[PDB]
Enzyme design. Structure first.
Site, PDB file in Angstrom:
ATOM      1  N   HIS A 123      17.377 -16.212  26.113  1.00 23.28           N
ATOM      2  CA  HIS A 123      16.085 -16.001  25.515  1.00 23.28           C
ATOM      3  C   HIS A 123      15.366 -14.896  26.247  1.00 23.28           C
ATOM      4  O   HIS A 123      15.767 -14.512  27.340  1.00 23.28           O
ATOM      5  CB  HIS A 123      15.255 -17.273  25.567  1.00 23.28           C
ATOM      6  CG  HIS A 123      15.189 -17.911  26.917  1.00 23.28           C
ATOM      7  ND1 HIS A 123      14.296 -17.494  27.888  1.00 23.28           N
ATOM      8  CD2 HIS A 123      15.925 -18.906  27.470  1.00 23.28           C
ATOM      9  CE1 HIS A 123      14.441 -18.262  28.955  1.00 23.28           C
ATOM     10  NE2 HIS A 123      15.446 -19.093  28.747  1.00 23.28           N
TER      11      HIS A 123
HETATM   12  C1  LIG Z   1      12.177 -23.242  32.765  1.00 27.93           C
HETATM   13  C2  LIG Z   1      11.691 -24.572  32.252  1.00 27.93           C
HETATM   14  C3  LIG Z   1      12.482 -25.334  31.404  1.00 27.93           C
HETATM   15  N1  LIG Z   1      12.025 -26.513  30.965  1.00 27.93           N
HETATM   16  C4  LIG Z   1      12.856 -27.320  30.070  1.00 27.93           C
HETATM   17  C5  LIG Z   1      12.737 -26.797  28.646  1.00 27.93           C
HETATM   18  C6  LIG Z   1      14.137 -26.386  28.231  1.00 27.93           C
HETATM   19  O1  LIG Z   1      14.556 -27.150  27.097  1.00 27.93           O
HETATM   20  C7  LIG Z   1      15.041 -26.679  29.418  1.00 27.93           C
HETATM   21  C8  LIG Z   1      15.734 -25.414  29.909  1.00 27.93           C
HETATM   22  O2  LIG Z   1      14.818 -24.322  29.869  1.00 27.93           O
HETATM   23  P1  LIG Z   1      15.256 -22.912  29.227  1.00 27.93           P
HETATM   24  O3  LIG Z   1      14.465 -21.820  29.907  1.00 27.93           O
HETATM   25  O4  LIG Z   1      15.219 -23.045  27.723  1.00 27.93           O
HETATM   26  O5  LIG Z   1      16.794 -22.780  29.685  1.00 27.93           O
HETATM   27  P2  LIG Z   1      17.213 -21.758  30.856  1.00 27.93           P
HETATM   28  O6  LIG Z   1      16.647 -22.387  32.107  1.00 27.93           O
HETATM   29  O7  LIG Z   1      18.722 -21.737  30.797  1.00 27.93           O
HETATM   30  O8  LIG Z   1      16.554 -20.459  30.460  1.00 27.93           O
HETATM   31  O9  LIG Z   1      14.228 -27.220  30.463  1.00 27.93           O
HETATM   32  C9  LIG Z   1      10.751 -26.989  31.352  1.00 27.93           C
HETATM   33  O10 LIG Z   1      10.355 -28.093  30.924  1.00 27.93           O
HETATM   34  N2  LIG Z   1       9.961 -26.279  32.170  1.00 27.93           N
HETATM   35  C10 LIG Z   1      10.360 -25.095  32.643  1.00 27.93           C
HETATM   36  O11 LIG Z   1       9.620 -24.436  33.406  1.00 27.93           O
END
Ligand SMILES: Cc1cn([C@H]2C[C@H](O)[C@@H](COP(=O)(O)OP(=O)(O)O)O2)c(=O)[nH]c1=O
Ligand SMILES: Cc1cn([C@H]2C[C@H](O)[C@@H](COP(=O)(O)OP(=O)(O)O)O2)c(=O)[nH]c1=O
Lengths: 135, 138
Positions: free
Chosen positions: A49
């Site tokens: 993303h």
């Molecule tokens: C980064 C982050 C993720 N999340 C949760 C929402 C997402 O569904 C999941 C992973 O975040 P996401 O940023 O979508 O994945 P990645 O870390 O691989 O980029 O964890 C939070 O609740 N708070 C946060 O600060």
């Protein structure tokens, strides 16, 4: 693309090493949130993303990983494997992280509270946002 | 003495574990600075001071270490040894850390910018300032 590889100043004392991060100390922004990612399996991938507002610094605190960043115009692969190096990216940069060592601990610093609504999960939209010369 | 051993809420997804920290997510304060300490040799000791304004969470991201905290009247020893737990301490608590494993990585979250003028390095005067604060109603 608006990324930099940062080289951290450390404080070597008391038989150990201290690395500090705050606005203007090994970090160009105001920190509001931290997270770390660990216990990776063989084909873990993170990211896929872009974010409208959050700037990031990624630091491998143990082990190492790879990151592919992408601004719509060019791409770069970056290795993170060092406690005195970080990758800084501006907002509106697409990223994926992968090829994590077994023992990797990834520390991420950002300037925003978590907001599901700042995310862009559709790559074509991202690229329209970065390139479309109308807007 | 005001401290708490937190159990962190983890996000288990994409074949990994994510731990988030910000105001009111696994942390009771507004984060402004983070630091981490590592590459400890055998006998290494950190701390030996109290801080007038800052609150802290201490996390052993890797390995283990021991912390002693002291309110001027009592003291308490705690082991930090995994990523799902940290030690929250309130301000004006004296601390010392020791017994670090060689692979220990210690992460600390705090609610202030670095400020030399907030440190109390002399235990005797720590006890006096703290006894006075407690005396005042704090
Ligand atoms: C980064 C982050 C993720 N999340 C949760 C929402 C997402 O569904 C999941 C992973 O975040 P996401 O940023 O979508 O994945 P990645 O870390 O691989 O980029 O964890 C939070 O609740 N708070 C946060 O600060
Ligand atoms: C924590 C910290 C320390 N320092 C410097 C000042 C100190 O002389 C030295 C170690 O910090 P100090 O807190 O005094 O020792 P410890 O980390 O064992 O508690 O590093 C900073 O410049 N910024 C910081 O955020």
């Amino acid at each position: 693309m608006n990324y930099t590889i940062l080289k951290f100043k450390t404080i070597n004392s008391k038989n150990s090493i201290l690395n500090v991060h705050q606005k203007d100390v090994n970090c160009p922004f105001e920190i509001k949130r931290i997270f770390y990612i660990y216990d990776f399996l063989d084909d873990s991938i993170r990211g896929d993303h872009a974010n409208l507002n959050s700037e990031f610094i990624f630091i491998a605190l143990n082990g190492s990983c790879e990151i592919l960043i992408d601004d719509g115009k060019t791409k770069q692969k970056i290795i993170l494997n060092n406690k005195t190096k970080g990758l800084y990216i501006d907002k509106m940069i697409w990223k994926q992280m992968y090829n994590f060592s077994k023992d990797c601990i990834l520390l991420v610093l950002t300037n925003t509270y978590y907001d599901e609504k700042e995310y862009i999960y559709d790559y074509k939209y991202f690229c329209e946002l970065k390139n479309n010369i109308v807007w």
